[PDB]
Amino acid sequence: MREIVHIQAGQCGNQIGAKFWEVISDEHGIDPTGSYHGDSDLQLERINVYYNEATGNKYVPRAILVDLEPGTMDSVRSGPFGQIFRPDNFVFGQSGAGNNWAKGHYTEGAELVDSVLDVVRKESESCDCLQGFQLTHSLGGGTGSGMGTLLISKIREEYPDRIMNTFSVMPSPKVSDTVVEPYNATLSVHQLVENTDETYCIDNEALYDICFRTLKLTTPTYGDLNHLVSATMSGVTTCLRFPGQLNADLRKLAVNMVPFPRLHFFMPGFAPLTSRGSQLTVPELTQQMFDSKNMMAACDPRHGRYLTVATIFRGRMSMKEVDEQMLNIQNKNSSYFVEWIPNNVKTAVCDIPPRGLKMSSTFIGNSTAIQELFKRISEQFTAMFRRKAFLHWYTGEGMDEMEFTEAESNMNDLVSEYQQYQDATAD
Amino acid sequence: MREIVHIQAGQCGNQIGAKFWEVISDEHGIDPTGSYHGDSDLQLERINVYYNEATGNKYVPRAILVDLEPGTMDSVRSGPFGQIFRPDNFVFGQSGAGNNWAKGHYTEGAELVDSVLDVVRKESESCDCLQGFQLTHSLGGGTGSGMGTLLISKIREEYPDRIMNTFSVMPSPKVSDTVVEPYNATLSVHQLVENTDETYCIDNEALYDICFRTLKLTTPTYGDLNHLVSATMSGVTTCLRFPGQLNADLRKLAVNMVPFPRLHFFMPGFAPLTSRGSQQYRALTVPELTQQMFDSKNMMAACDPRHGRYLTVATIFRGRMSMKEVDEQMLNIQNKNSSYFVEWIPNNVKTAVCDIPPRGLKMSSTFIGNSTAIQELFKRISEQFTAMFRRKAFLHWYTGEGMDEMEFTEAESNMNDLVSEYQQYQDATAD
Amino acid sequence: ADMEVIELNKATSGQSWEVILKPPSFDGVPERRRDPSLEEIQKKLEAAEERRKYQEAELLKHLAEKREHEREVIQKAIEENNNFIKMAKEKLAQKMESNKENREAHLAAMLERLQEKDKHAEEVRKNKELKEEASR
Ligand SMILES: Nc1nc2c(ncn2[C@@H]2O[C@H](COP(=O)(O)OP(=O)(O)OP(=O)(O)O)[C@@H](O)[C@H]2O)c(=O)[nH]1
Ligand SMILES: Nc1nc2c(ncn2[C@@H]2O[C@H](COP(=O)(O)OP(=O)(O)OP(=O)(O)O)[C@@H](O)[C@H]2O)c(=O)[nH]1
Ligand SMILES: Nc1nc2c(ncn2[C@@H]2O[C@H](COP(=O)(O)OP(=O)(O)O)[C@@H](O)[C@H]2O)c(=O)[nH]1
Ligand SMILES: Nc1nc2c(ncn2[C@@H]2O[C@H](COP(=O)(O)OP(=O)(O)O)[C@@H](O)[C@H]2O)c(=O)[nH]1
Ligand SMILES: C=C(c1ccc2c(c1)c1ccccc1n2C)c1cc(C)nc2ccccc12
Ligand SMILES: C=C(c1ccc2c(c1)c1ccccc1n2C)c1cc(C)nc2ccccc12
Ligand SMILES: [Mg+2]
Ligand SMILES: [Mg+2]
């Protein structure tokens, strides 16, 4: 289990995807020309997971950049790390998706999907031991949402024995591009429930509130939100990228984090929460796992129970202090952990802190509280669907009202399942 | 009827066997190179019974050393008299018996048994007049027990007209090597009842108690126990080895000691009882030596002679003593303790006197008794056996070698039948 | 009630005579069996030899039965070991085949679910053509 093939789809997908590559290249000592200039042998031990080794001791992200709109990938190319990507790995269309899931999934996206699969095939065939796929996309739009989920199902058909991991960004009216975001997100969730092994729920409602309430940013931009996403994405992938201690891979993460196949939606958490220019103790970092204020998904952990938790501590710290502190949180907050999954919290420590931070903590949680996020999207969806508002945008692309009904009930079924395990006691 | 072929099998068998050869070689004036250096012609008159005469006026024990484990015979070879044995007479395997009677009797032992019989054949064919076989072994382990009894039955088939004599050492929890000892001993006793002419019951329970209670040794070792065994083995064989009054061979011993074929288990007794460090004693007169025949404290089998009746007794007095005093004293014990002798076997006590005392002693007495009290030893083994067999504990180690549970049932009832027969004669009155 | 010395014989190395103290109380004198032949003796000796020969023969016959039992035990241990090997071989073959079948069936069902989606997508795009260009 070595190589991960990274795919970024749509405006949101390519924006957060670029920021991920900028952040992890800095950690690994890779400059925008692909050259290594670090001073630690730990930086290069597992470089092979995300980078291909090119001639002249250079490293190239194993990344595929997809969009139906050409504009976004021009912005990527001109960005800080724009030149680091393989030019042939940029698969762009010319007519966008118009924030319509149907356009991305059935029309414009269906026409570009074969061109993308040709590039995924070329990357994947070159792998010694393919772990699987990591996809970045938003669920509110049309390319990331519709085309991204069409890509997932097509890759699922060609590589059924590989892990499908996504960083899916949930829509919010607090940061809204389109009125049909509840439809796009519901149609996508339906696809993710069925076709992914593990999904990180990056909620724009949570990111907006972190910026506004905590960071006191009156008017946050996508740049402000994306700073929190890149910090989380770096934290959550630490154990795939760095040696020890444990030798984590995506299947190992899936096996230990997912007790029921459909319940694979993770509620990420991060500490400390900072703004795009900022340059804390072990007990302080540990306490932020129950803090609703630190969650990347708009849910209160204390409104559910954790099925499983994987926590990453980064920086030079006492590993003994971490162990003591983590056990303390479990003993003091026992009622927020399911008793029928023994020893359901796992901790990892990495000597390398992320950029601009001396100490950090990331929480990957499989909590029943994530139902609050799915209930929120469902309420918004129903307000609109009840009145058949904007439906002609979708039916115009050939979709049936039936597909909306089916996706809605599949998401409500997902909610009921989270409730079932929240009420379940050890007998 | 001159030569005896000696066989020693297993760990215990070789330990007590080596000690027998060290002790009798000293008595006969044979040094570890096989050379004679004594000052009595009585020492060489009957040397031919246990020793083969080799070139250069040397003497070689007519001994066969057997084991499934190679280790023990290396310990023998390195011992005091290790160099005295014929090198070709060492028959050792490489995988032991894992203290399992089935392994010794049917598996590992069955594979080595032909190699042993080839060596017995070579010794026996060279004999002018073969008396028979003398086997040393324990009944608690795998080789001595299982393989030793397989050897007995194979020798019985090839030499049916020769005497089979054993020195069989009985297990006790007081000195235990393995948990499966009661099974191993029961399966062996069954074989001994059927295939031996005469057996000396050397009981480790009796040896432990002599060391602990009498010799006041807090923690006795195998060495302490084996000191009593070698003294007994020397005493019991005196009349086969030394000239005097009766001559004596293994058949004559069997004929006069065994009234019923199955009742051939002898309860040996010795006086004085000494330790290795006991370099005194300044003790024991003829009346004192004679009194020790009813003393339970002097028995090499854990049985009280006073709990049964003697069918027959053979008594060896060793050293310079009044033969008239011995005769008077022995008659006195029979007249005073009349109720402990069966009345339907007239004049059932025979006495022998040998001028040569054993080493470190100036006067000794050995008793070979065929007493009904030996049923106590067999009842003890049977109780231990049933405690385990009732629960079928460790049985798979035996059935795994191909044995049937039936063989366990049969051996147990044959030993209980042996007990009832001893009882039958204990209650039998002269009518 | 007297005595009577009656001279018997006198030779060079000695003399002999009979002395009668009192005559017998009964005047009229007191108040072997053939053969046995060599054949009779031979018969008795040979009958004993045949009894000894019978006893020894019957004891060897008992031991012969033991050798047979010893071979039967060894053979049983071989048979039990061979049966263990064969049962373990068959049970393993069954597990490996049942598992291959289950894994194949899981993958088959997964790909069928995705194939259903592909058939539905054709229908969606077909339904779009029935609307578009069809009306203005
Ligand atoms: N005592 C001890 N336990 C270990 C060691 N390595 C792993 N374990 C324990 O073994 C269990 C996990 O087994 P592993 O040996 O790591 O697994 P594996 O056999 O390599 O199998 P996979 O990694 O799942 O392919 C846990 O209880 C670990 O604590 C070690 O060197 N010593
Ligand atoms: N008077 C006397 N009796 C003897 C003599 N030798 C043996 N006896 C007695 O004879 C009886 C035993 O008979 P033995 O003559 O020794 O024996 P054997 O007939 O040669 O044959 P085995 O019994 O086969 O030894 C006993 O009562 C002995 O006391 C002897 O020289 N003189
Ligand atoms: N956090 C974050 N959300 C974004 C970003 N760009 C767009 N979004 C969200 O994505 C949704 C619209 O999808 P978008 O990616 O722009 O469209 P697509 O190109 O058709 O996939 C809305 O919910 C936006 O709030 C971004 O860079 N960061
Ligand atoms: N008296 C005595 N008993 C011994 C000696 N060594 C072992 N034993 C006994 O022998 C039994 C075990 O048999 P052992 O001879 O060691 O095993 P084998 O080699 O498989 O025949 C136990 O009852 C032990 O007490 C020894 O030298 N002297
Ligand atoms: C492999 C894991 C992992 C996850 C959750 C787990 C276990 C192992 C586990 C073991 C014993 C008991 C409970 C357990 N739980 C709930 C992993 C851990 C961490 C801290 N971070 C990761 C980051 C990337 C990939 C994988 C990981
Ligand atoms: C031959 C015997 C022997 C045994 C018991 C006997 C008789 C003879 C006997 C004769 C007349 C009446 C009763 C008799 N009983 C009970 C013998 C005796 C002794 C003292 N020690 C021996 C040591 C080695 C070999 C043999 C012996
Ligand atoms: Mg391993
Ligand atoms: Mg004679």
Short mmCIF file of N, CA and C in Angstrom, two decimals, chain A residues 179-187 376-395 399-412:
data_model
loop_
_atom_site.label_atom_id
_atom_site.label_comp_id
_atom_site.label_asym_id
_atom_site.label_seq_id
_atom_site.Cartn_x
_atom_site.Cartn_y
_atom_site.Cartn_z
N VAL A 179 -28.74 28.93 -5.44
CA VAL A 179 -29.92 28.56 -4.67
C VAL A 179 -30.20 27.05 -4.66
N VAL A 180 -29.67 26.30 -5.64
CA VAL A 180 -29.94 24.89 -5.82
C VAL A 180 -28.93 24.00 -5.11
N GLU A 181 -28.05 24.61 -4.27
CA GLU A 181 -27.04 23.85 -3.49
C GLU A 181 -27.65 22.70 -2.72
N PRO A 182 -28.86 22.80 -2.08
CA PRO A 182 -29.43 21.62 -1.40
C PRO A 182 -29.71 20.42 -2.32
N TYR A 183 -30.11 20.67 -3.58
CA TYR A 183 -30.36 19.60 -4.57
C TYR A 183 -29.04 18.94 -4.95
N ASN A 184 -28.03 19.74 -5.29
CA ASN A 184 -26.72 19.26 -5.70
C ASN A 184 -26.10 18.42 -4.62
N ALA A 185 -26.16 18.93 -3.37
CA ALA A 185 -25.59 18.20 -2.26
C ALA A 185 -26.31 16.88 -1.97
N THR A 186 -27.66 16.85 -1.99
CA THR A 186 -28.46 15.63 -1.75
C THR A 186 -28.18 14.58 -2.80
N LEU A 187 -28.16 14.95 -4.09
CA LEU A 187 -27.89 14.04 -5.20
C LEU A 187 -26.48 13.45 -5.07
N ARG A 376 -29.75 19.10 8.23
CA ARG A 376 -29.72 20.46 7.72
C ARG A 376 -29.90 20.49 6.19
N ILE A 377 -29.13 19.68 5.42
CA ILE A 377 -29.23 19.59 3.96
C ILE A 377 -30.62 19.08 3.58
N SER A 378 -31.15 18.06 4.28
CA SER A 378 -32.47 17.50 4.02
C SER A 378 -33.61 18.51 4.20
N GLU A 379 -33.53 19.37 5.25
CA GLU A 379 -34.56 20.38 5.51
C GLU A 379 -34.59 21.39 4.38
N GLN A 380 -33.41 21.85 3.92
CA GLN A 380 -33.22 22.80 2.83
C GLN A 380 -33.73 22.18 1.53
N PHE A 381 -33.35 20.93 1.26
CA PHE A 381 -33.80 20.17 0.10
C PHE A 381 -35.32 20.11 0.06
N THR A 382 -35.97 19.71 1.18
CA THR A 382 -37.42 19.57 1.23
C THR A 382 -38.15 20.85 1.07
N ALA A 383 -37.63 21.97 1.63
CA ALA A 383 -38.26 23.28 1.49
C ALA A 383 -38.40 23.56 -0.01
N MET A 384 -37.35 23.28 -0.78
CA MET A 384 -37.31 23.52 -2.20
C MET A 384 -38.09 22.49 -3.00
N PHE A 385 -37.86 21.16 -2.75
CA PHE A 385 -38.47 20.04 -3.48
C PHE A 385 -39.99 19.97 -3.34
N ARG A 386 -40.53 20.29 -2.15
CA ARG A 386 -41.97 20.32 -1.83
C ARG A 386 -42.73 21.19 -2.84
N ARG A 387 -42.11 22.35 -3.22
CA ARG A 387 -42.62 23.36 -4.15
C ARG A 387 -42.11 23.15 -5.60
N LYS A 388 -41.25 22.11 -5.85
CA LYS A 388 -40.62 21.72 -7.13
C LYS A 388 -39.87 22.91 -7.78
N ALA A 389 -39.32 23.77 -6.91
CA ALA A 389 -38.58 24.97 -7.24
C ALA A 389 -37.31 24.59 -7.97
N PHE A 390 -37.01 25.22 -9.12
CA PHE A 390 -35.78 24.98 -9.91
C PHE A 390 -35.64 23.58 -10.50
N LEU A 391 -36.67 22.74 -10.38
CA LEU A 391 -36.63 21.37 -10.87
C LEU A 391 -36.40 21.22 -12.37
N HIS A 392 -36.91 22.19 -13.17
CA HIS A 392 -36.79 22.20 -14.62
C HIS A 392 -35.35 22.32 -15.06
N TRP A 393 -34.44 22.87 -14.19
CA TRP A 393 -32.99 22.95 -14.45
C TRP A 393 -32.39 21.58 -14.60
N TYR A 394 -32.94 20.61 -13.85
CA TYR A 394 -32.53 19.22 -13.77
C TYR A 394 -33.25 18.34 -14.77
N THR A 395 -34.60 18.40 -14.80
CA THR A 395 -35.43 17.64 -15.74
C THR A 395 -35.13 18.01 -17.19
N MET A 399 -33.09 14.33 -16.36
CA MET A 399 -33.34 13.74 -15.05
C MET A 399 -34.83 13.59 -14.77
N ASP A 400 -35.17 12.67 -13.87
CA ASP A 400 -36.55 12.41 -13.48
C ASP A 400 -36.69 12.90 -12.05
N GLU A 401 -37.92 13.29 -11.65
CA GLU A 401 -38.26 13.72 -10.28
C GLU A 401 -37.98 12.57 -9.28
N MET A 402 -38.08 11.30 -9.76
CA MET A 402 -37.86 10.04 -9.06
C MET A 402 -36.47 9.99 -8.43
N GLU A 403 -35.44 10.44 -9.17
CA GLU A 403 -34.04 10.47 -8.72
C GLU A 403 -33.88 11.37 -7.50
N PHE A 404 -34.67 12.46 -7.44
CA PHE A 404 -34.67 13.39 -6.32
C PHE A 404 -35.28 12.72 -5.10
N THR A 405 -36.42 12.03 -5.30
CA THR A 405 -37.15 11.31 -4.25
C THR A 405 -36.25 10.24 -3.63
N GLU A 406 -35.58 9.43 -4.48
CA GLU A 406 -34.66 8.36 -4.10
C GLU A 406 -33.45 8.88 -3.30
N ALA A 407 -32.79 9.95 -3.78
CA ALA A 407 -31.63 10.54 -3.11
C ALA A 407 -32.02 11.06 -1.74
N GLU A 408 -33.19 11.75 -1.64
CA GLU A 408 -33.77 12.30 -0.40
C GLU A 408 -34.00 11.18 0.59
N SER A 409 -34.69 10.07 0.18
CA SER A 409 -34.94 8.99 1.13
C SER A 409 -33.67 8.27 1.54
N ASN A 410 -32.68 8.13 0.63
CA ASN A 410 -31.39 7.53 0.99
C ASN A 410 -30.64 8.36 2.06
N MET A 411 -30.71 9.69 1.97
CA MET A 411 -30.11 10.59 2.97
C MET A 411 -30.86 10.57 4.33
N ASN A 412 -32.19 10.43 4.28
CA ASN A 412 -32.99 10.31 5.49
C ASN A 412 -32.72 8.97 6.16
#
